[PDB]
Design a binder for this molecule. Structure first.
Ligand SMILES: Cc1cc2c3c(c1C)C(C)(C)C[C@H]1C=C(c4ccccc4)[C@]4(C(=O)NC(=O)N=C4N2C[C@H](O)[C@H](O)[C@H](O)COP(=O)(O)O)N31
Ligand SMILES: Cc1cc2c3c(c1C)C(C)(C)C[C@H]1C=C(c4ccccc4)[C@]4(C(=O)NC(=O)N=C4N2C[C@H](O)[C@H](O)[C@H](O)COP(=O)(O)O)N31
Ligand SMILES: [K+]
Ligand SMILES: [K+]
Ligand SMILES: [K+]
Ligand SMILES: [K+]
Ligand SMILES: [Mn+2]
Ligand SMILES: [Mn+2]
Lengths: 500, 500
């Protein structure tokens, strides 16, 4: 099966790419696996595959860390993401995000039901498993639980059957047969939960599939529109209908090649302690347990020699940056264009801890609008900050066409030199805020409201007559022939490879 | 003579350090020298010494580019700055800035007058030179003149004789015997000019010395206090009285080993076209000529085989970042401490185009103050933004003791995650602004006023009870023994030198 359609094949692809380290000696899921993975993420090393995890029994489980993290070379920096999508390993960020957006104006390709698959190779009923007995990792030393769920896909469906959502949200072990996890507005798992709670009749049928098709976990991490079933979006993106099998204990459908499947319910009434967790912005606040949603597990099914993917998230760079930020930026780009805003590109700079998105403006189109910074900033911020795709993003930076928004150095240069603090900004206090950012949930103001800004790094003439500067750089401040002469003579003179 | 006391010796030191490329074939001062230098600065390469400059006659002149720019390795990143100061080439930024601040509570060591020196080896009177005939560089293709002066020291003295100031300010050739240049408030060359203009009797006696003692050019780039003669500050810093010789045509004194000396006057009445110039923030606005101050040159004296230092300034990284930003930050650190503010460190992040300064706070001392963010931000911003040392800086970022302000990644992390836009900031509109920043002089508001902000990246408990988080990083989220085990086993497992 292709790597983008089968997690087991994706692991082989990473090996084939010389992007895997297999560790066959015993590794402790209590911190050691996650520490190794953390170190990998902070240094852009090869992904670790822990084949001998202390506490693994009856095939549950191996761990793959850092599945969507960065490679060291520039040329295949994003190669792990490209391997989620059947793209060449040298694919650019633009190409990855375009692939992720491509299904937005295609007909869905609904999934195909098949009678069985590898995820049915083994099973454990409610008398045979105990989640406290599995080698679930402690990912950070102060975490409030062992976070089994950092890179699986929750599956929930609307009461009326018309929308089946796939998404990543964290969850930790509560006891032998329950998890607790984050289920917060405006996320689709929360929106569907609310539908069930208003109906009031039953708990939500649920499945959590780990080691799903890589193309599916990418969509699971992306804020595609309300009401859109991710399976059909992934089908359209990949050009193939995804093969799904029915759960044994409910009528939800999981990818046939899922490594591990939990089947059960998401309660409409119960909660339990959840968190704290070392999170995407780089922090844990020890002891800050909150209540979270409570999941009951009724059945486990799994592949022979099952592999659990794990995100050891925190400071740069891991899945919470490469996937959450970039995929939100992609959706924001489209949202802006659909609102008739002249945005060509969007990216969440890693340097901002993916709390900013830089929006590249087609300034020819901007000039034709005959508008001003105040007006344009307000329009852009209303569109983005009032939409779910803008939820995680607290600062938008508008830049003109000379800036490559995928290059954080250039975004920072533009922001720092072209946006006058205060005057060239509009603050938004009456929008949904993202509480996970420390300055929100642990800050001086309301955890759930405000704290957002549009920072206009467009220069005045970009609205009127056109760019009126040249950069004081090698590229722009010397003629072509001279630049070429310098480059041609560079090593000859005494001064100091793309792949590497 | 020691490298920090003699520019010719400094050039030898760079050679000895394997930090020089001598170019002995013809190089054009029309753009080519500066393009090579620009490329060096953008790639942290070796400094270029142009020994065969097209248009050099009768010993005027060779060029050294990139005299204060960065080296590629991390271990001796700041080695060129260390070589200005007699510090080991591995000196940290903290050590360099402490050296630069050390003379602030020492008695000055006034200079020593000597009868002659190398700067007297050759002379040209007013009938023998023509500044349009010298190999003065065109540094950027759209510059409004050939900028002879990018790394020399202007020397002017108060009318009463009590203060002799040394400073860097740009100047370009106007005609055979005049320059134009920037002379703007609140700079000391401007303050002294104003004294002469109010006296109204004569033009200002002036000298411009190129290739001065490196320790002197560092002080020339630093906003030491009003009224303080840089020569005595440099004497105290180095522990040695600087040797100066008298000008021939006026009673000012220049370093004995200066490579090139211009003697003349700075007019109290005349101006001429000045600029545009590709500047420290990375931009030129072609055609934006302004009037500038006008200098008359009466005499040139120079060393045999004179060398002109040149800054090919613009985008990162050159002298305008390494020296202007860092030396302003140093002075701001001291200013804050002298105002009883609990600041331990200050640095202008390169990523901010040296328009921010990050201030590291001793949060134990902060807690004892029993204050709030609003109050503290206002206090800090009043101190800094009302002082000349804060002139160039438009954003102050307050960070706690876990952040190394010399590491821009960590400043950006703290800013992005700990400072809520708007609420955690105080804007300052009624302070002097720095017009050279594009969003000031070419922006939407007053070029000379406002546009400043204090951004508080201290978290709430840093004011009260103490830090209440741990980072989600390898360092903080795993115990010491485990971290060490991981590191010890890193290469054994399959994963991937300080000097490199
Ligand atoms: C790639 C990835 C995504 C997420 C997470 C993680 C990884 C690795 C971990 C490591 C588990 C960290 C936490 C931290 C998380 C977090 C919480 C809120 C917002 C963003 C992140 C969270 C989480 O617990 N809760 C959450 O509501 N969304 C999460 N997302 C984002 C989420 O997958 C996207 O937003 C997506 O669009 C959802 O789908 P839909 O609702 O649009 O169908 N989660
Ligand atoms: C290291 C360096 C410093 C400066 C410059 C340059 C280099 C290489 C060039 C490349 C020529 C670019 C321009 C760009 C410049 C610029 C203009 C205004 C502020 C900052 C920079 C300027 C300039 O034209 N005018 C100016 O008033 N100050 C300059 N300084 C800063 C100045 O040396 C310090 O501020 C110092 O503290 C002065 O001494 P004092 O007055 O305190 O005694 N100049
Ligand atoms: K999703
Ligand atoms: K602007
Ligand atoms: K000075
Ligand atoms: K704050
Ligand atoms: Mn969804
Ligand atoms: Mn001074």
């Amino acid at each position: 099966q292709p790597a983008h359609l089968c997690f087991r094949s994706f692991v082989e692809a990473l090996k084939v790419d010389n992007d895997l380290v297999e560790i066959n000696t015993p590794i402790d899921p209590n911190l050691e696996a996650a520490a190794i993975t953390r170190r990998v993420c902070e240094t852009n090393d090869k992904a670790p595959l822990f084949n001998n995890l202390i506490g693994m029994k009856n095939g549950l489980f191996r761990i793959l860390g850092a599945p969507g993290s960065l490679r060291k070379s520039s040329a295949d920096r994003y190669g792990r993401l490209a391997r989620h999508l059947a793209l060449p390993p040298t694919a650019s960020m633009r190409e990855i995000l375009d692939k992720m957006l491509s299904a937005s104006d295609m007909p869905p390709i609904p999934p195909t039901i098949v009678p069985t698959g590898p995820c049915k190779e083994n099973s454990l009923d409610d008398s045979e498993f105990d989640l406290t007995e599995l080698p679930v990792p402690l990912i950070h030393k102060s975490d409030g639980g062992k976070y089994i769920q950092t890179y699986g896909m929750h599956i929930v469906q609307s009461p009326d059957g018309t929308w089946t959502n796939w998404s990543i949200a964290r969850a930790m072990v509560h006891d032998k047969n329950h998890l607790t996890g984050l289920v917060i507005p405006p996320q689709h798992i929360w929106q569907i939960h609310q539908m069930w709670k208003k109906e009031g009749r039953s708990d939500v049928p649920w499945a959590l599939a780990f080691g799903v098709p890589p193309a599916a976990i990418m969509a699971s991490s992306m804020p595609i529109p309300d009401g859109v079933t991710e399976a059909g979006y992934v089908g359209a993106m990949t050009g193939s209908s995804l093969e799904l099998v029915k759960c044994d204990t409910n009528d939800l459908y999981v990818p046939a090649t899922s490594e591990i499947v939990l089947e059960g319910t998401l309660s409409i009434s119960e909660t339990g302690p959840e968190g704290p967790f070392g999170e995407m912005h780089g922090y844990i606040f020890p002891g800050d347990t909150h209540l979270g949603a409570k999941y009951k597990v009724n059945r486990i099914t799994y592949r022979n020699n099952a592999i659990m993917p794990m995100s050891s998230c925190g400071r740069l760079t891991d899945e919470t940056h490469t996937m959450i930020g970039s995929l939100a930026a992609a959706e924001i780009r489209k949202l802006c264009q659909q609102n008739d805003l002249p945005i060509t590109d969007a990216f969440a700079p890693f340097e901002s801890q993916v709390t900013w998105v830089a929006l590249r403006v087609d300034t020819e189109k901007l000039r034709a609008m005959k508008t001003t910074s105040e007006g344009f900033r307000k329009r852009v911020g209303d569109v983005v900050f009032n939409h779910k795709a803008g939820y995680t993003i607290h600062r938008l930076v508008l830049v003109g066409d000379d800036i490559d928004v995928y290059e954080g150095k250039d975004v920072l240069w533009a922001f720092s030199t072209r946006c006058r603090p205060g005057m060239d900004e509009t603050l938004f206090e009456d929008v949904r805020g993202f509480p996970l950012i420390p300055y929100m949930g642990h800050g001086n103001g309301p955890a759930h409201r405000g704290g957002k800004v549009v920072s206009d790094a467009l220069m005045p003439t970009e609205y009127t007559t056109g760019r009126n500067w040249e950069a004081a750089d090698f590229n722009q401040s010397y003629p072509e022939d001279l630049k070429q002469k310098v480059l041609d003579n560079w090593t000859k003179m005494g001064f100091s490879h793309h792949h590497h």
